[PDB]
RNA sequence: AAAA
């Protein structure tokens, strides 16, 4: 807690100590703006506050203006004062303001600034002597001559105070190229209120993260369709990834080599599989069969992560890639049974516990140093095998159910994945009774609909399995009833632009004329979420997946990207309170990044 | 308007120099000052006499001088606010300058201007500080006197009804003071998911004072605000509206055959109704509605009159969307060849005709959709559920119409045989046909029944269901699956009994449900039986659930919108209209 | 406590 005290004196320097001793409770620091006029005496303030080293103090000098004469001088001074105020809030709390010194215009400007950005209390100091000595204020306050007038209490706009990140890179705002950016901010607020009032039709609604305060130029830029040039804005955007397999993250290249390196014992590590030739990845120009695409990732996965060191390195690298992409929430699909090995007492449960422990350690160590971190949950993928061993699905479900009971931990199991061969041999109809247990235990269910997904199959998945999220399902608009049901039941679809681009084949690949249905789904209201599926085999992260929508779905707007992020948040398997916290954080970060992108 | 506003001090220059702030002449200027003898009005009066058109008004703050004391400052601030509101121009915002006066008075005037609106806040300055009016003429001729204006201010639209609630009070002292606005200002931050749950994103454009007032707890005195709100009703039985009073008389008098109408029997009255101080069983609750219903609505004319009166009451309550539950078989007789289908068609046609007529006249209209009630064990054999399900499925195919059947409702009386887990067999067709399922899983129902209705019957909404707090697993299942609960505060308060009704200590779980995240909605059940429309049903929350905020009421309305059985395309435009209306009413209801 |  720090009670920053703000004041400003014309030439009479007695006001600042008067304000300091107005409240005998004491404060933490005082910051005062003053002109560069020679009539002002900072030596008195320096020597008076030097007696209290425990309280910080500073003086900011407005160069180039001894006094306010014309409109230009006052405007530039107001810009400078707004900037200095912006650099001097408490990190979380509000400051205090006094208006006993200075000219009328500058005091009114300071009060306007306090109203705009908010303050704990706005007051003045009054005395019946107006003295000039310093060894008399103590006698005046002992007798009671000092009078303080408290009138102000104001929250301001949180969004209008969120722009403390716009000020720097301004070389001191010299006269030759001065930029009144806080003047642009006040034009922003005035314009927002004026379009809100004088207009009714165009000023109705549209913001999905409830921003509604960005400058109107920012809103117009958001409405315009994005291009491949918006990669800088997309990269800074806090994104959500919901479909990201753990075993298909580092399948080739330097990441694969360095995950092979820290693999505990390197004796059992062998150089198997190979990348695919003529495939101009990640922007392939030919369809790839699902089996061949899966085999492309065989370099890393079930046969490689069987040792603890390799698995730990893989998950650490995945978390590093996620945080490097500004992904603020992720849900990693992992198959613990694949990496289980009873030979070394490495069951599926201990593999899942290792993944959970390393993710929690990474998130906690990132939170301790106060840096960007990716809160990641896990999905126990209950894949279909049916090479015998029908108990495999039951074991996966039981492990997923019993893994929730950890209770604590920043990383936790949230749901299961119904992947596998989506053929009619393993439709969702048979498992209406297996999944009563998984539903009663609070787990969520996500399903795969990559191929041979008849609308009856998806109906069974969303009505018998009660899947709250679907995978791919690129042919929803073929069946209008299925699309209507998905719309009404508010279930989301995990659509991966690169995986669907390569596996199924969409425009502008030659000999393929099918259009990507992401834009049509968004218009229909489908809670679509752009994901990665496999960072390794697909070869691209979430930023590139969002960028490619400029080509797969022409005319897609940036506001639609914000809609996609909001839908990913809404369809995520998280509790209500955590969802609201995530929504607040995403709103704040979206506001900041939009302001930065529009200004630069 | 064209009104200037300024403060006075030692020098009288301030008003003459501010007079020519506009470059094309001004209309009328007013001055506020204290009782200090230093100020002379003679110079300003003489200077204004040269221009007889301008209205000169001088107001002296009685009994105050130099504003040196805390109480003196508070007195001056209160009188300044009263004078500012009394001198508030009717339509156009006024200009204001604050160069003169003490820093304290200047700050108070700036706060007043930024709180009640201002056409512009500006300043006057002169390098040489002139004294003789000849020096002002010289200054305007050779142009040193600049005009300093930090930027045009919007001001907050609604703070002017205070000038109506307070009289002139020419004679005043320290006895009279109104902390009406300072009470909301003090509690601005003096009081986690509140801000995150902010619905209707245009609420961010609201004034910070208005936003703070929105965060304040609900009170019984803001019925005027709660009435002007556009609300959504999702649980409103058609046959429980015109039960007693003039409504019953005018719905009976419009019957085609008044001879067969029984005008003798009337429902009993309970003291304190609708805020009954004693609990009542559900059977007697339905008994109150015996005046209307099946035995009355058989006649076509009276049924049409009932529908028209219900729509008129919905519009009068400023409800912008409703989902009326009707049981066509209850009002269908074969004596005059009146099947259930023709009854449903008559209700639908009356509703769509009313909506179209109101829309073509560009008035406020309530969009109405119908729910077909599939009652259990009412008329004997249980083929009625199948007949009603088929009726709903066929009636949803009509296509054309602003009013359409959107789903079915399942009705259970108390418990056990009235459980929502016996008829799971019929509902595959109704799910696949595009309809939505709602269950009356209320009035002390066990968690297993609600769970079965949620999962086996795929119900999208649950009626009442006040016992979710005792089943945390069920509560989590409801929360994560985004299944709304429609609770009627008045019906539950009258039947179940909660605080502050005497002899009962249980408290309504409305606030707890809102905090948990359940998409809870507030409805009317039966307007006639409960004797309470949606406005007062929402208002009674401030009494049943203390600490509920107005922003929580807005969240309740948003939840009602979200859980409605509407298409996404219609939902988007409904949300847009609701956001605009909410912003408009909030911007013109902080006025009190 | 720079046109108190
Ligand atoms: N698109 C998919 N469709 C069906 N099942 C999938 C899909 N992606 C992953 N899986 C499941 O995850 C595993 C994929 O292959 P594998 O068993 O070898 O482990 P992995 O590490 O996750 O991937 P990889 O094959 O690259 O090693 C299988 O269990 C598979 O059922
Ligand atoms: N990667 C993240 N970085 C920062 N905050 C996050 C992140 N992910 C989630 N959050 C949320 O932000 C808050 C973390 O910081 P904290 O709890 O101290 O509140 P805060 O500091 O006011 O918010 P912020 O960190 O955004 O400034 C939590 O509400 C958390 O849910
Ligand atoms: N609280 C309730 N519980 C169960 N069923 C209800 C409830 N309220 C209304 N109903 C249903 O409405 C009908 C009850 O009465 P009725 O059939 O005579 O016509 P009504 O207009 O809906 O109400 P009433 O005539 O009793 O005033 C039944 O279909 C019943 O299932
Ligand atoms: N009671 C209502 N009053 C006004 N508009 C409503 C009402 N209910 C719904 N609306 C919405 O207003 C629009 C109805 O009028 P219409 O479809 O012709 O467009 P509009 O005239 O441009 O909008 P508005 O009626 O608000 O001026 C729809 O978007 C509708 O969802
Ligand atoms: Mg996948
Ligand atoms: Mg009911």
UniProtKB/TrEMBL annotation, chain A:
Q: Which residues bind ATP 10?
A: 373, 581, 585, 588
Q: Is ATP-binding given among the entry's keywords? A: yes
Q: Which residues bind ATP 8?
A: 302, 338-339
Residues the record lists as binding Mg(2+) = 243, 245, 448, 533
- Sites where the protein binds ATP 1: 162, 373, 588
Q: Which positions does UniProt annotate for ATP 7 binding?
A: 298, 338-339
Positions that bind ATP 4:
245, 298, 302, 383
Q: Where does ATP 6 bind?
A: 297, 302, 338
Q: Indicate which residues the UniProt annotation says bind ATP 5.
A: 247-248, 302, 335, 338-339, 383
Source species, domain of life: Bacteria
What name does UniProt use for this protein?
Uncharacterized protein
* Species in which this protein is naturally found: Bacteroidales bacterium
Automatic annotation (TrEMBL), chain B:
Q: For binding ATP 5, which residues are annotated in this chain's numbering? A: 239-240, 294, 327, 330-331, 375
Residues where ATP 4 binds: 237, 290, 294, 375
User: Which of this chain's residues are annotated to bind ATP 7?
Assistant: 290, 330-331
Ligand binding (ATP 3): 164, 577, 580-581
Residues that bind ATP 1, according to the entry?
Answer: 161, 365, 580
Q: Which domain of life is it from?
A: Bacteria
Q: Where does ATP 10 bind?
A: 365, 573, 577, 580
User: In which residues is ATP 6 bound?
Assistant: 289, 294, 330
Residues the entry annotates as binding ATP 8: 294, 330-331
The molecule here is called Uncharacterized protein
């Amino acid at each position: 807690m720090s009670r920053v005290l703000l004041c400003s004196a014309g030439h009479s320097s007695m006001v600042v100590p008067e304000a300091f001793h107005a409240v005998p409770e004491g404060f933490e620091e005082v910051h005062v703006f003053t002109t560069d006029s020679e009539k002002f005496n900072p030596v008195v303030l320096n020597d008076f506050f030097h007696s209290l080293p425990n309280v910080r103090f500073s003086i900011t000098k407005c160069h180039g203006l001894a006094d306010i004469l014309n409109e230009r001088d006052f405007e530039f001074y107001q810009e400078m004062l707004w900037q200095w105020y912006l650099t001097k809030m408490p990190d979380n709390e509000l400051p205090y303001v006094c208006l006993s010194g200075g000219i009328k215009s500058m005091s009114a400007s300071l009060q306007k600034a306090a109203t705009l950005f908010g303050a704990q209390s706005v007051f003045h100091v009054l005395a019946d002597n107006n003295p000039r000595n310093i060894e008399e204020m103590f006698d005046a306050l002992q007798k009671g001559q000092i009078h303080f007038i408290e009138m102000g209490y104001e929250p301001g706009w949180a969004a209008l105070r969120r722009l403390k990140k716009i000020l720097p890179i301004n070389e001191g705002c010299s006269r030759d190229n001065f930029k009144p950016l806080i003047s642009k901010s006040i034009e922003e607020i005035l314009s927002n209120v004026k379009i809100m009032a004088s207009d009714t039709g165009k000023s109705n609604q549209l913001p999905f993260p409830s921003l509604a305060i960005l400058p109107p130029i920012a809103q117009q830029w958001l409405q315009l369709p994005l291009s491949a040039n918006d990669g800088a804005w997309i990269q800074n955007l806090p994104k959500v990834d919901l479909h990201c397999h753990l075993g298909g993250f580092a399948t080739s290249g330097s990441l694969l080599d360095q995950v092979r390196g820290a693999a505990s014992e390197p004796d059992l590590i062998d150089r198997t599989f190979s990348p695919q030739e003529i495939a101009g990845w990640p922007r392939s120009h030919k369809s790839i069969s699902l089996d061949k695409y899966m085999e492309l990732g065989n370099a890393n996965g079930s046969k490689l992560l069987k040792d603890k060191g390799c698995l730990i390195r893989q998950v650490e690298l995945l978390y590093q890639s996620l945080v490097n992409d500004n992904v603020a929430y992720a849900e990693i699909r992992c198959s613990p049974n694949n990496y289980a090995d009873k030979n070394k007492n490495r069951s599926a449960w201990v593999v899942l516990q290792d993944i959970n422990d390393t993710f929690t350690r990474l998130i906690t160590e990132a939170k301790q140093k106060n840096q960007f971190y990716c809160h990641v949950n896990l999905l126990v993928i209950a894949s279909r095998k049916f090479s015998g061993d029908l108990s495999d699905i039951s074991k996966h479900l039981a492990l997923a159910i019993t893994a929730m009971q950890q209770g604590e931990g920043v990383c936790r199991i949230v749901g299961v994945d119904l992947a596998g061969f989506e053929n009619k041999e393993t439709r969702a109809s048979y498992y209406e009774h297996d999944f009563k247990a998984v539903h009663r235990c609070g787990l969520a269910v996500t399903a795969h609909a990559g191929e041979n997904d008849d609308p009856e199959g998806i109906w069974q998945a969303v009505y018998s399995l009660h899947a709250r999220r679907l995978g791919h399902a690129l042919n929803l608009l073929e069946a209008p009833d299925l699309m209507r049901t998905v719309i009404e039941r508010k279930i989301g679809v995990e659509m991966c632009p690169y995986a669907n681009y390569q596996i199924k084949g969409f425009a502008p690949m030659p000999n393929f004329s099918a259009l990507y249905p992401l834009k049509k789904y968004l218009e229909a209201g489908i809670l679509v979420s752009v994901n990665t599926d496999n960072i390794g085999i697909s070869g691209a992260n979430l930023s590139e997946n969002l960028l490619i929508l400029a080509d797969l779905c022409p005319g897609i707007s940036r506001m639609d990207v914000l809609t996609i992020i909001r839908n990913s948040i809404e369809t995520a398997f998280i509790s209500h309170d955590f969802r609201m916290e995530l929504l607040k954080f995403f709103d704040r970060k979206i506001y900041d990044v939009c302001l930065i992108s529009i200004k630069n």
